[PDB]
mmCIF file of C-alpha atoms in Angstrom:
data_model
loop_
_atom_site.group_PDB
_atom_site.id
_atom_site.type_symbol
_atom_site.label_atom_id
_atom_site.label_comp_id
_atom_site.label_asym_id
_atom_site.label_seq_id
_atom_site.Cartn_x
_atom_site.Cartn_y
_atom_site.Cartn_z
ATOM 1 C CA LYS U 1 149.840 73.352 107.010
ATOM 2 C CA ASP U 2 147.245 70.774 107.130
ATOM 3 C CA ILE U 3 149.833 67.966 106.890
ATOM 4 C CA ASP U 4 149.314 65.482 109.610
ATOM 5 C CA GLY U 5 152.841 64.179 109.331
ATOM 6 C CA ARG U 6 152.822 61.577 111.885
ATOM 7 C CA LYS U 7 155.392 59.029 110.231
ATOM 8 C CA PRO U 8 158.704 59.407 112.340
ATOM 9 C CA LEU U 9 161.448 57.409 110.489
ATOM 10 C CA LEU U 10 164.387 55.853 112.564
ATOM 11 C CA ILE U 11 167.912 55.391 111.007
ATOM 12 C CA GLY U 12 169.930 54.432 113.748
ATOM 13 C CA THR U 13 170.676 54.683 117.322
ATOM 14 C CA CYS U 14 171.852 58.159 118.733
ATOM 15 C CA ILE U 15 175.241 55.879 119.396
ATOM 16 C CA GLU U 16 176.143 55.852 115.562
ATOM 17 C CA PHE U 17 174.401 58.961 114.985
ATOM 18 C CA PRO U 18 174.518 61.729 117.576
ATOM 19 C CA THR U 19 172.342 64.843 117.544
ATOM 20 C CA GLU U 20 174.260 66.849 115.288
ATOM 21 C CA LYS U 21 174.332 63.961 112.640
ATOM 22 C CA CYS U 22 171.051 62.613 113.344
ATOM 23 C CA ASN U 23 169.194 65.661 112.117
ATOM 24 C CA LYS U 24 171.790 66.376 109.546
ATOM 25 C CA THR U 25 170.821 62.901 108.191
ATOM 26 C CA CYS U 26 167.329 63.376 108.640
ATOM 27 C CA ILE U 27 167.445 66.774 106.635
ATOM 28 C CA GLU U 28 168.768 64.803 103.641
ATOM 29 C CA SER U 29 166.341 62.289 103.834
ATOM 30 C CA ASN U 30 163.908 64.977 102.973
ATOM 31 C CA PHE U 31 162.570 65.094 106.647
ATOM 32 C CA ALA U 32 161.812 67.785 108.883
ATOM 33 C CA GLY U 33 165.161 66.628 110.622
ATOM 34 C CA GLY U 34 165.624 64.452 113.462
ATOM 35 C CA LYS U 35 166.903 64.205 117.190
ATOM 36 C CA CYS U 36 167.674 61.706 119.873
ATOM 37 C CA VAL U 37 164.875 60.664 122.328
ATOM 38 C CA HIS U 38 164.469 57.791 124.617
ATOM 39 C CA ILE U 39 161.521 55.072 124.149
ATOM 40 C CA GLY U 40 158.963 54.557 126.881
ATOM 41 C CA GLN U 41 161.315 53.640 129.642
ATOM 42 C CA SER U 42 164.156 51.780 127.885
ATOM 43 C CA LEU U 43 166.290 54.886 128.240
ATOM 44 C CA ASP U 44 167.605 54.149 124.827
ATOM 45 C CA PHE U 45 168.369 57.197 122.672
ATOM 46 C CA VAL U 46 167.478 56.588 118.818
ATOM 47 C CA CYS U 47 167.714 58.942 115.971
ATOM 48 C CA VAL U 48 164.209 59.553 114.265
ATOM 49 C CA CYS U 49 163.308 61.906 111.584
ATOM 50 C CA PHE U 50 160.106 63.831 111.218
ATOM 51 C CA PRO U 51 157.839 64.223 108.202
ATOM 52 C CA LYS U 52 157.620 67.356 106.117
ATOM 53 C CA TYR U 53 156.649 66.272 102.521
ATOM 54 C CA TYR U 54 154.242 63.507 103.776
ATOM 55 C CA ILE U 55 151.150 64.362 101.775
#
């Protein structure tokens, strides 16, 4: 897998899209799924997907 895949996609805040939905939403988006993580020190959870077919 020589795919760099370095373009995460934010859909919403983990508030509206918890861990379960977050990833599921990312799956249908054609991404390697997603998760809930904090930003720098904003302690704000967000749903971000990962590249999979980005060539």
